[PDB]
Amino acid sequence: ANHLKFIARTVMVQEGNVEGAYRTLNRILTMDGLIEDIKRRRYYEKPCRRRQRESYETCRRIYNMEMARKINFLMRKNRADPWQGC
Amino acid sequence: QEVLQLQEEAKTFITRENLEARVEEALDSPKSYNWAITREGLVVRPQQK
Amino acid sequence: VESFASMLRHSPLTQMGPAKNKLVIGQIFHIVEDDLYIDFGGKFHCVCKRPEVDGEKYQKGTRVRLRLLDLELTSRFLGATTDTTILEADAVLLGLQES
Amino acid sequence: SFSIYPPIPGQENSLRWAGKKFEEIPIAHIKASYNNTQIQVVSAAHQPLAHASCGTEGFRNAKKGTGIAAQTAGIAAAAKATGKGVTHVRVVVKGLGPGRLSAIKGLTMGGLEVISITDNTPIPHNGCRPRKARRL
Amino acid sequence: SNEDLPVPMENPYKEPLKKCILCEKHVDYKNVQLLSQFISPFTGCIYGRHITGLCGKKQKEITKAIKRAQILGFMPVTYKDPAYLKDPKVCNIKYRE
Amino acid sequence: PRYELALILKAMQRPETAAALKRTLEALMDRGAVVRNLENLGERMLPYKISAHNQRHSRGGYFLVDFYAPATTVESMMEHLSRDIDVIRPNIVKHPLTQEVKECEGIVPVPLEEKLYSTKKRK
RNA sequence: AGAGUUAAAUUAUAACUAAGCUGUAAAAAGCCCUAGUUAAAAUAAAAUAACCCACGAAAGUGACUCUAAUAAUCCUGACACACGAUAGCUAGGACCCAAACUGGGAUUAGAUACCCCACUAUGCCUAGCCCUAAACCCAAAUAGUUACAUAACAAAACUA
Numbered sequence: 009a010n011h012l013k014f015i016a017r018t019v020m021v022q023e024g025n026v027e028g029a030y031r032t033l034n035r036i037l038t039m040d041g042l043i044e045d046i047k048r049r050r051y052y053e054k055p056c057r058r059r060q061r062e063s064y065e066t067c068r069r070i071y072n073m074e075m076a077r078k079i080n081f082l083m084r085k086n087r088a089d090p091w092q093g094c
Numbered sequence: 095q096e097v098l099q100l101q102e103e104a105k106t107f108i109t110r111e112n113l114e115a116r117v118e119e120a121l122d123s124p125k126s127y128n129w130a131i132t133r134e135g136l137v138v139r140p141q142q143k
Numbered sequence: 144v145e146s147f148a149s150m151l152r153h154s155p156l157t158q159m160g161p162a163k164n165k166l167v168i169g170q171i172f173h174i175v176e177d178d179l180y181i182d183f184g185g186k187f188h189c190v191c192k193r194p195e196v197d198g199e200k201y202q203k204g205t206r207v208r209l210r211l212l213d214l215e216l217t218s219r220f221l222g223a224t225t226d227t228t229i230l231e232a233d234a235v236l237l238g239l240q241e242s
Numbered sequence: 243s244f245s246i247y248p249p250i251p252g253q254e255n256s257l258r259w260a261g262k263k264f265e266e267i268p269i270a271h272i273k274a275s276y277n278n279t280q281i282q283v284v285s286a287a288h289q290p291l292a293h294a295s296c297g298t299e300g301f302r303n304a305k306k307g308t309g310i311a312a313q314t315a316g317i318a319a320a321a322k323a324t325g326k327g328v329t330h331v332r333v334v335v336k337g338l339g340p341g342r343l344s345a346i347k348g349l350t351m352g353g354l355e356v357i358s359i360t361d362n363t364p365i366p367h368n369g370c371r372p373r374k375a376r377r378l
Numbered sequence: 379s380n381e382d383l384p385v386p387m388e389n390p391y392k393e394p395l396k397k398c399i400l401c402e403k404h405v406d407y408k409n410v411q412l413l414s415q416f417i418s419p420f421t422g423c424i425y426g427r428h429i430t431g432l433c434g435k436k437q438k439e440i441t442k443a444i445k446r447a448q449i450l451g452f453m454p455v456t457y458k459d460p461a462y463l464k465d466p467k468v469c470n471i472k473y474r475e
Numbered sequence: 476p477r478y479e480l481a482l483i484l485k486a487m488q489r490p491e492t493a494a495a496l497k498r499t500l501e502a503l504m505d506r507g508a509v510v511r512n513l514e515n516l517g518e519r520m521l522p523y524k525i526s527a528h529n530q531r532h533s534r535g536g537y538f539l540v541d542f543y544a545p546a547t548t549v550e551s552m553m554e555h556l557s558r559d560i561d562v563i564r565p566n567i568v569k570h571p572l573t574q575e576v577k578e579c580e581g582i583v584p585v586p587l588e589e590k591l592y593s594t595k596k597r598k
Numbered sequence: 599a600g601a602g603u604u605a606a607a608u609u610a611u612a613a614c615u616a617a618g619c620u621g622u623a624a625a626a627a628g629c630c631c632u633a634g635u636u637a638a639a640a641u642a643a644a645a646u647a648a649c650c651c652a653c654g655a656a657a658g659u660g661a662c663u664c665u666a667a668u669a670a671u672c673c674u675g676a677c678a679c680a681c682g683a684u685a686g687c688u689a690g691g692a693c694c695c696a697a698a699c700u701g702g703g704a705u706u707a708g709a710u711a712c713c714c715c716a717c718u719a720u721g722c723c724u725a726g727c728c729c730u731a732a733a734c735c736c737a738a739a740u741a742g743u744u745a746c747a748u749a750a751c752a753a754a755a756c757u758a
């Protein structure tokens with residue numbers, strides 16, 4: 009409100025395609041976590057009920073990180089197998 | 095060593111008289127701290143003017 | 144008689160030291176269509192993909208140039224006691240036994 | 243480097259639409275609320291040229307929520323605005339609701355030309371406490 | 379009496395430890411360019427470690443520095459100052475694909 | 476240097492500016508302060524518009540005053556700065572150069588944590 | 599623990615503009631001293647950073663600045679001493695927003711509830727009480743060891 013307007017969260021559509029530029033802006037906000045925050049902040053969420061969220065999120069992030077790594081590590085051996093029908 | 099550093103800066107301090115000088119000088123020579131970084135750790139300071 | 148420790152101290156596998164970015168010589172002992180299984184002699188063979196340049200030049204028995212990345216592929220993962228082995232080593236293909 | 247989005251308020255940038263500076267192009271406020279949408283097209287001078295609501299468009303208490311209604315309001319809004327002769331519009335969406343995209347499309351399809359989207363959706367930096375969550 | 383046994387020395391092949399892009403740099407709240415380098419252009423967000431890729435101490439340092447630069451008003455909150463949008467980009471984010 | 480004074484001042488012409496700075500350092504030298512240096516950072520358009528003394532300002536001049544002062548004092552100078560009609564925002568920070576540089580030796584790599592869960596032959 | 603400060607948001611209150619605005623699974627009631635825009639103090643609460651894991655004895659503590667400042671050459675120890683989330687009580691201020699209660703509106707066989715709408719004690723400050731929690735990491739303190747060893751499950755087993 010004290011900041012200069014139109015500098016923030018602004019995309020300018022190129023070659024007149026609107027839908028593309030909107031997708032772009034959406035990708036911005038969702039990349040920064042603002043959509044999850046708006047949606048979060050429609051109602052309240054109590055501090056306890058918040059650390060639960062945090063911890064469940066962070067556990068899940070750890071799991072998915074690890075499992076991802078493991079998958080991409082074992083990726084090589086997806087290759088068609090040499091020894092078949094030994 | 096410390097005491098001598100301060101002894102050296104005591105000549106450069108601003109005192110009641112030098113106000114007239116210093117202030118007039120401060121307006122004459124704007125100084126920037128504005129300073130940047132490169133992915134290699136290198137700095138690029140503001141481009142020469 | 145040679146003591147084992149001596150055999151160890153003077154071996155090439157010791158002399159090489161750390162595995163990263165080493166330039167190694169290797170041999171192709173098995174082929175599946177795009178994939179060439181290369182024993183450079185270390186413990187485990189590595190795998191490669193036949194390059195576009197001179198495809199038919201790389202055959203079983205052919206000798207090859209390798210840039211050795213890792214002597215073997217291993218890591219420990221979430222809730223694991225022992226780390227996990229691929230039973231291969233990581234290497235890159237440079238040229239074929241440039242002579 | 244073509245179409246860097248955020249054109250500066252300094253004059254270093256010459257790009258004109260209908261021979262106007264980006265500062266002079268009309269602002270269309272879109273407000274997308276879960277039960278509603280409203281567009282208001284205003285001059286760079288802040289004199290309102292067009293207003294359309296999902297209700298003003300003759301939908302009713304629930305149905306006025308939908309994206310259908312949004313594009314509907316958008317069209318007629320751009321009609322009233324086109325009547326006063328605005329070619330180009332820089333748009334701002336306020337709130338996050340069903341008729342965001344629909345209404346923006348509604349301005350285009352309604353024959354109004356869009357340059358910019360910027361999102362001003364109020365994001366508390368932890369000011370006023372929200373109302374309690376619901377089932378409880 | 380076996381002179382060919384191994385030696386109990388430290389690892390000579392030990393690789394030098396990696397460095398945060400600022401390791402032994404100096405973060406001041408005064409250079410807003412620097413602090414601008416770690417902020418999301420559209421939001422005014424502060425990027426996390428997993429983006430910036432900094433040590434613990436340098437992240438923390440940067441964060442505090444920024445907040446100071448915001449209240450004292452050398453730097454704005456809700457957008458990256460346009461002057462600095464054209465400067466070198468440090469972080470790993472891809473917005474536009 | 477011990478303390479640092481960030482002066483954001485109402486943008487004026489030169490004489491009025493000079494006046495303001497002068498009387499500022501006078502006030503400081505009266506509360507017992509030793510002034511090291513004066514660094515003009517220019518007149519910038521503020522990042523955002525600041526409202527003080529019933530005036531809402533767009534631009535401002537920027538100044539930096541390094542000085543030594545006794546602990547008891549800082550409040551006094553802050554008060555006398557807040558009172559002032561042309562200060563568009565004051566502040567006083569412990570001068571950055573008292574804070575030490577403790578060498579980042581680098582990243583101490585964190586290994587995956589083991590022996591969290593018991594060894595159990597489950598399923 | 600003090601003292602000073604405010605970026606986002608919100609609200610008074612004006613200027614325009616349109617008749618609606620709000621609200622749900624769907625509605626109704628409610629409000630049009632309404633709504634969108636443009637201005638704007640106070641009060642309250644502190645996005646991102648945090649994929650961090652620091653500080654405190656615990657409760658607790660994450661906007662900014664400065665002042666004061668974190669017991670013990672360090673074993674255990676009470677019915678003694680000093681603290682102790684929320685809620686609550688006493689007196690005085692504060693009041694954006696939230697909100698037990700309550701009154702409307704729906705739903706329902708009923709609906710003293712879940713959904714909707716207002717509005718209050720109350721959350722906020724200063725001073726004084728009250729001394730309770732799933733105050734739980736349900737895992738006492740201080741030195742140790744990984745020997746011996748799987749009731750089950752959970753955070754593996756044990757000495758002194």
Ligand SMILES: [Mg+2]
Pocket residue numbers: 009
């Ligand atoms: Mg406003």
Ligand SMILES: [Mg+2]
Pocket residue numbers: none
């Ligand atoms: Mg998060």
Ligand SMILES: [Mg+2]
Pocket residue numbers: 368
């Ligand atoms: Mg928060």
Ligand SMILES: [Mg+2]
Pocket residue numbers: none
């Ligand atoms: Mg309950």
Ligand SMILES: [Mg+2]
Pocket residue numbers: 592593594595597
């Ligand atoms: Mg198990």
Ligand SMILES: [Mg+2]
Pocket residue numbers: none
């Ligand atoms: Mg107090």
Ligand SMILES: [Mg+2]
Pocket residue numbers: none
């Ligand atoms: Mg405000």
Ligand SMILES: [Mg+2]
Pocket residue numbers: none
């Ligand atoms: Mg307002």
Ligand SMILES: [Mg+2]
Pocket residue numbers: 609
């Ligand atoms: Mg208002």
Ligand SMILES: [Mg+2]
Pocket residue numbers: 622
């Ligand atoms: Mg609904």
Ligand SMILES: [Mg+2]
Pocket residue numbers: none
């Ligand atoms: Mg009605």
Ligand SMILES: [Mg+2]
Pocket residue numbers: 648
């Ligand atoms: Mg968070």
Ligand SMILES: [Mg+2]
Pocket residue numbers: none
């Ligand atoms: Mg924590």
Ligand SMILES: [Mg+2]
Pocket residue numbers: none
């Ligand atoms: Mg202690």
Ligand SMILES: [Mg+2]
Pocket residue numbers: none
């Ligand atoms: Mg004791």
Ligand SMILES: [Mg+2]
Pocket residue numbers: none
């Ligand atoms: Mg208590």
